[PDB]
Protein: endothiapepsin
Organism: Cryphonectria parasitica
Amino acid sequence: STGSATTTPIDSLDDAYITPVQIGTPAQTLNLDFDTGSSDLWVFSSETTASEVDGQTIYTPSKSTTAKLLSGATWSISYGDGSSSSGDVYTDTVSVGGLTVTGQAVESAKKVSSSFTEDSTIDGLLGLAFSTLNTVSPTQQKTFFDNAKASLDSPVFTADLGYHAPGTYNFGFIDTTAYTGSITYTAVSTKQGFWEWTSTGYAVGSGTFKSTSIDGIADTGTTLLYLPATVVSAYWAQVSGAKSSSSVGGYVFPCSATLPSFTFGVGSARIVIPGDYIDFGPISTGSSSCFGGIQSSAGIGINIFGDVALKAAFVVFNGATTPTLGFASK
């Protein structure tokens, strides 16, 4: 089998992407944030604290004939950005882009943090990291991909995120029309539950390529590109007036600037992030200080190839027995 679904930016900055997901019988369609950096499929629901719901579409398991309480199971998750959610668990039929899994753990939120409440466009998350990170207790649950894997034509999914435009998540096949040149595959470590890999280096603008190993995670659920402070400083040094602001929370630059591109290595291949992709616009409405899309990972504890990087590429998440990551230009 295969599945194919369009993913759409939630706003004019590509702060995140939502993908429609069918849950239950009859189908209840919720717009979920597909997140290769976590492993829980959780939704706003009829169980969510009323004051913590503000415009989201909810899953109501009592209206689904295929929903079953997973008795005794609870979940609780905190994300790298300080947000969190928790609740209980149902199993139900879940379909993405025509690909159906029966008996998927659908984690029903009883509580969500303010960041989720405040984002009316995201109805929940669909995790696509390794199932070892799933937070369901006392019986850990599998991701949608893990459950679908055996039935897929090939044990893969691909992310093709757009810049200020819709893109595509495919499950079970590689669309050879969706990229240019060849796909370069690179090793993955699953030791921390992430799609963790090692970039071979970087370049700033038209500058020379610096060969250096940068371990990090391919994370569709993180907006920006987080790299070692040395790398990030080298980038922003090429932008007149750019500086790290403790008050704002990272590198800012004059909105009048033209940003240089940033290149990262994948084996002997190169992925070029155009300068425009690195612009996250005014820090507040009407400001002439703009927020940068490349930020330091210092104090995160891990480098993160988030949407800023991934959207510059066609990305293959290869879930074969020995997993790998593939990157192509597009």
